[PDB]
Structure formats: structure tokens, C-alpha cells
């Protein structure tokens, strides 16, 4: 019986890690390194997800930009993030109920699995939307800030976090079907 418990708790901790990645990219400090070292003068952008920093050293807001329909894509993006987090927390909650019975089960665990799948389904869409938006932000001449550095930062690790979220989901739900 120690085996199934180790599997379940391991999956719980893994999804907790995924939540840490969720917080990680939800708290991105610079989602893309950036530069415009114009031979003007040298420039180094550091675009946080809601916080376009420049680097003397400075960080700036710059959120909710062009254009309109894209802003709505940001709405769907953030809503998808919130529901993502909700499915996460419901997952951990169903895990805690499993702990309470460790202190349906199957019928409950699979539910969380499903939600976690849904969670994984949403953020992978969400980031697309975000990346979509980001490309669009680059596509429309980003005011002046159009770095050649263009490369992904913190959130990609969160994409892996959604990956291991689906992974731990599959592992614990397999632990459930093994019953």
C-alpha cells in the first residue's frame, strides 16, 4: 500500500512544482531579452510579461497594447490563466481529499486528472495566444522597442510545467486505474 501512496504523493508534489512554474511565468521578470544598440546609442530591452524593463537600469509597465481584438485575446489569455490556476487548485484539493481518506477515491481522482488535463489543455492554448499576441506586438512595429534579441525566457519552463502537470496527472490516475 506504500507504493500507491508514494505514487500519489509524488504526483501531488510534481503538480505543486507545476504550480510553482505557473507562479514563475505569472511573475516573469523579462519574458524576452531585448536590444537596440543603434550606432543613436546602445540599448538593452528586458521585456517582462507585464513589465517592459530597459537597461540606466529601469523597468516600466507597458501592458495592454495594440490592437483591440488583440486586447481581447489577452482577455481570453488571462481568463484561461485564472481557470488554469483554478483547475490546479481543484486538483490539489481532490488530492487532499484523497489524503483525508488516506488518513469513491478513484472516481474522485480521475476527476482531478480530467481537470488537470483540462488545465494542461488551457495553458498550452493560453501561451499560444500570448505568443500569438507577442508576435503580433512585434508584427505591428512595437512603438520603438523591436529587439533583435527576440527569444523566449521564463514561460517556456512553465510550458514544461504544464507538461509535468499532465505527466503527474497521468501517473496518479494510472495509480488509480491500477486499483
Amino acid at each position: 500500500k506504500t507504493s500507491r501512496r508514494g505514487r500519489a504523493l509524488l504526483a501531488v508534489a510534481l503538480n505543486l512544482l507545476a504550480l510553482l512554474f505557473a507562479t514563475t511565468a505569472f511573475l516573469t521578470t523579462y519574458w524576452c531579452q531585448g536590444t537596440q544598440r543603434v550606432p543613436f546609442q546602445l540599448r538593452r530591452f528586458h521585456t517582462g510579461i507585464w513589465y517592459s524593463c530597459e537597461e540606466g537600469e529601469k523597468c516600466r509597465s507597458f501592458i495592454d497594447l495594440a490592437p483591440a481584438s488583440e486586447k481581447g485575446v489577452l482577455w481570453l489569455s488571462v481568463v484561461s490563466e485564472v481557470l488554469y490556476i483554478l483547475l490546479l487548485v481543484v486538483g490539489f484539493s481532490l488530492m487532499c481529499l484523497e489524503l483525508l481518506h488516506s488518513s469513491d477515491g478513484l472516481k474522485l481522482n480521475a476527476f482531478a486528472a480530467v481537470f488537470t488535463v483540462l488545465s494542461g489543455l488551457l495553458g498550452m492554448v493560453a501561451h499560444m495566444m500570448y505568443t500569438q499576441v507577442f508576435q503580433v506586438t512585434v508584427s505591428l512595429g512595437p512603438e520603438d522597442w523591436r529587439p533583435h534579441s527576440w527569444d523566449y525566457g521564463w514561460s517556456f519552463c512553465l510550458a514544461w510545467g504544464s507538461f509535468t502537470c499532465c505527466m503527474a496527472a497521468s501517473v496518479t490516475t494510472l495509480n488509480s486505474y491500477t486499483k
Binding site: 488535463v117 494542461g120 498550452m124 505568443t131 510550458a159 497521468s170 494510472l174
Partner: protein, 83 residues
């Protein structure tokens, strides 16, 4: 032309990361119908058209159809791009 990159060129690396993650997501769904077993079955799904052995609809077989449509679209787009 770097050995390898030229094949990679028609479709962007990000798109690859996306198709990979998406497939991984599709993969587990078959297991829901039932970490290794049905994931292996999904490995038996991407390899050939899409999914099998479903006792008429059930649940994930329609996922197999959507996945078939999916891989179909992507490979078509790829070939068109290289062309």
C-alpha cells in the same frame, strides 16, 4: 547549410514544440478512456493514421478522428511549405 537544420526550416521550432506538447496531451486522453500503457497505445496512434481498438465510439475514438484530421492538416501544410 548546417547538417540537419535545413529539414527543420520549413516549419518553425516553436511549432514543433507545440505539436509535441499537443500530441502528448492527446496521448493521455486515450488512457482516460481506459504513465505507460495507453500512452504506448497513443504511440501506436501517431504512428498510423490515428488510434484503434475502440469499441465503437466509446470516447477517445473521436479523439482519434480529430487527431487524424489534425496530423493530416499539418503534414499537408508542411509539404506545401517545402514546395
Amino acid at each position: 547549410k548546417p547538417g540537419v537544420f535545413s529539414f527543420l526550416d520549413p516549419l518553425a521550432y516553436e511549432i514543433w514544440m507545440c505539436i509535441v506538447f499537443a500530441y502528448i496531451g492527446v496521448s493521455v486522453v486515450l488512457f482516460l478512456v481506459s504513465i505507460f500503457n495507453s500512452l504506448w497505445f497513443s504511440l501506436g496512434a501517431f504512428m498510423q493514421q490515428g488510434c484503434d481498438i475502440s469499441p465503437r465510439s466509446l470516447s477517445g475514438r473521436i479523439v482519434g478522428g480529430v487527431w487524424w484530421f489534425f496530423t493530416l492538416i499539418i503534414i499537408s501544410s508542411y509539404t506545401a511549405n517545402l514546395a
